[PDB]
Structures are given as structure tokens and as C-alpha cells.
């Protein structure tokens, strides 16, 4: 009974820690375009989240399928074997709630630069 | 490198103009895209951008709601959808390739350029 | 929005003569302003961008220079291939927009 709400509240965490993660993994693909005043494409054109690679497992680790990482991402409206940026941003459920009317790309702007506002919109969600 | 325009002609006020641009000799996926007019006599009015993903297009003031910008990277093509034409779009309409400082997409400029095609609106 | 004005609108000069031709915006563009050469039923020609750096295949003679909003392209010694229509564009905000013009005109 208590030991079992102890490991509910540690899947609970592990979930919380994933989504965070992908956030990460956005967030720097954001500020690597910002570097190199850079656009960013966050549709099928932008990278795949769905990608060992990125949460630090190899091509075919087996563990992969059963990773709190994929858990999230394959759970997911949007998921299709492959999954965007804005298919993750966009998608339910996740404790970070949805965005809506994303644009399929921002690109790099001069002045009011897109790719700097959907870095602050991104943002504050990892809050 | 090459830009050939095509699909300009003679329509009347409120009609409707296709202009294609067909790029060779480099990799059009890569670079975005402009058009650009003179008409008879004046100087270079900038009308419209396009990505180079072809997602997001950017317009002059004269030409909002009226022309669409567009592109097909598997043809290798530009296109300007040109609506509600009226006598004041009258002009030669170039196609132009946009340059980026190396490694970032920071437009600089038009560094290469169609021969232009001619588009006359008149009753 | 934002304007640019050349001046002059013309402008008479000789072989050897030095060319100076002024572009000021309304509004501050830091460098990003570039110099095309157009000549009669021929397409413009990109000669200088980011305010001072010279396309490549563009002879020395040919200078860019400015910040903000005052912009300054300058032929050193004026040659016969140079007499021709320049424009200015700004392209730090969208829409870009052209100067009027500038025709260099040969002086007798």
C-alpha cells in the first residue's frame, strides 16, 4: 500500500523529468539557430523527437521502446511513428498543456527576429 | 546559375497573371527568393519574398492581398500569383536569388537576376 | 514603413572624376543596406552590400560606407562601363524598399 504510492509518485517523476527533457532537446535546437542567426523549421522538415540519439540511447537499443522518454512521445495525439516540434508542442496529454497555431517555421528576421519569440514562448513552458 | 522568367503578357484590370521562375545551375531548396519590378521609366520596387522552405512569404504594401508568392522545390520553380491586377502593376517583373552570410540565413542581397518578363495591365 | 532617398536624382561627371552618391533612410538600418548598378533594358547588378563589403567580380574603385541611416557609395575614378542608374535597398525591415535612383550621366 505505501511502497506502491512510493513507486506510483516515482513513475510520476520520471514522466515530469522526460517531458523536461524534450523541452531541452527543443530549447537547444532554438538557441543553435539563434548562434548561427539561423531559422528554425518545426514541422516534418525540422528534426524528429522520436529519435534514440537524442535522450542518449543508441540506434537499436532495445530499452529505448521501454524509456519514460518514449512513453511520453508515443502516447501522444500527434505521434505517428515519427513526431515534430510541433507535434510534440502541439499534442496531448502532457503536463504542459498544448500550443496551438505554431507556424511551421520561424525564420530569421532582423528585427523582432520570429526564431527569438518562439524561443520565449518555448520558455515558459519549461516553467 | 540561371533565372528564366515566363508568364507575363497583356490582361485587363482585375484579372489574373501566373509568373514562373525556373532555377538551375545550384541548389534552389537552399536560398530564398524575391520578386522584384520596374515599371515603364521608374526605379526597383522589392514586391515579394519567399524561404526557402517556402513557408513564410513577406509583401510590399501595394501588392498585399492581391499577389501570392510561391514556390515548388521539386520543380525548381518560383511562381507570383498576381490577382485584381490593375494598371499600375504594369511592369518587367524579375525573379531574384537572395545570398546569406555564410552559414547563417542573414540576408544581405540580391546577387543574381532573372532578364525579367513584362506584364502590361490595360483596358 | 521605411524610406529611402537618394540624392542626387542625377548627377553629370567624367571619366577619371570621383563619384559620390548619398542613400539616407528614415529610420536606423544599421549596415544592412546594399548598392545595385542597373543600366538601360539590362537587370541590376548587387555591387556593394552590407553597407561597405564589395561583391566579389566588382573592380576597387567602387566603396561603400555608412551606419544607421547616412549612406555613401563612392566611385573613385569614374570609368566608361560606369555610367549607369544606381539604387540603395534596405533590407532590415520588412518590406524591403529601394531608393528612387541615381543616374550617372556623361558631362560635355
Known amino acids: 500500500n505505501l511502497n506502491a504510492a512510493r513507486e506510483l509518485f516515482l513513475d510520476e517523476l520520471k514522466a515530469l523529468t522526460a517531458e523536461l527533457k524534450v523541452y531541452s532537446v527543443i530549447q537547444s535546437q532554438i538557441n543553435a539557430a539563434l548562434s548561427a542567426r539561423q531559422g528554425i523549421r518545426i514541422d516534418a522538415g525540422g528534426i524528429d523527437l522520436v529519435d534514440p540519439t537524442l535522450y542518449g540511447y543508441a540506434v537499436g537499443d532495445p530499452r529505448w521502446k521501454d524509456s519514460p522518454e518514449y512513453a511520453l512521445l508515443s502516447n501522444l495525439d500527434t505521434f505517428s511513428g515519427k513526431l515534430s516540434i510541433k507535434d510534440f508542442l502541439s499534442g496531448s496529454p502532457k503536463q504542459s498543456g498544448e500550443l496551438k497555431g505554431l507556424s511551421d517555421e520561424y525564420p530569421f528576421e532582423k528585427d523582432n527576429n520570429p526564431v527569438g519569440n518562439f524561443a520565449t514562448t518555448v520558455s515558459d513552458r519549461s516553467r | 546559375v540561371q533565372l528564366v522568367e515566363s508568364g507575363g503578357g497583356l490582361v485587363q484590370p482585375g484579372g489574373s497573371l501566373r509568373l514562373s521562375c525556373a532555377a538551375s545551375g545550384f541548389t534552389f531548396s537552399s536560398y530564398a527568393m524575391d520578386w522584384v519590378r520596374q515599371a515603364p521609366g521608374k526605379g526597383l520596387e522589392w514586391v515579394s519574398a519567399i524561404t526557402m522552405s517556402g513557408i513564410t512569404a513577406y509583401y510590399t504594401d501595394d501588392v498585399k492581398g492581391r499577389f501570392t508568392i510561391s514556390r515548388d522545390n521539386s520543380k525548381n520553380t518560383l511562381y507570383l500569383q498576381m490577382n485584381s491586377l490593375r494598371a499600375e502593376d504594369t511592369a518587367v517583373y524579375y525573379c531574384?536569388?537572395?545570398?546569406?552570410?555564410?552559414?547563417?540565413?542573414?540576408?544581405?542581397?540580391?546577387?543574381?537576376w532573372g532578364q525579367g518578363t513584362t506584364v502590361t495591365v490595360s483596358s | 514603413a521605411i524610406q529611402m532617398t537618394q540624392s542626387p536624382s542625377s548627377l553629370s561627371a567624367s571619366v577619371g572624376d570621383r563619384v559620390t552618391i548619398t542613400c539616407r533612410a528614415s529610420?536606423?538600418?544599421?549596415?544592412?543596406l546594399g548598392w545595385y548598378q542597373q543600366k538601360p533594358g539590362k537587370a541590376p547588378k548587387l555591387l556593394i552590400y552590407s553597407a561597405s563589403t564589395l561583391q566579389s567580380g566588382v573592380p576597387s574603385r567602387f566603396s561603400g560606407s555608412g551606419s544607421g541611416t547616412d549612406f555613401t557609395l563612392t566611385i573613385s575614378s569614374l570609368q566608361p562601363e560606369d555610367f549607369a542608374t544606381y539604387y540603395c535597398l534596405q533590407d532590415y525591415n520588412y518590406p524591403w524598399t529601394f531608393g528612387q535612383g541615381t543616374k550617372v550621366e556623361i558631362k560635355r
Open positions: 531574384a536569388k537572395e545570398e546569406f552570410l555564410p552559414g547563417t540565413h542573414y540576408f544581405y542581397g540580391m546577387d543574381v
Open positions: 529610420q536606423g538600418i544599421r549596415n544592412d
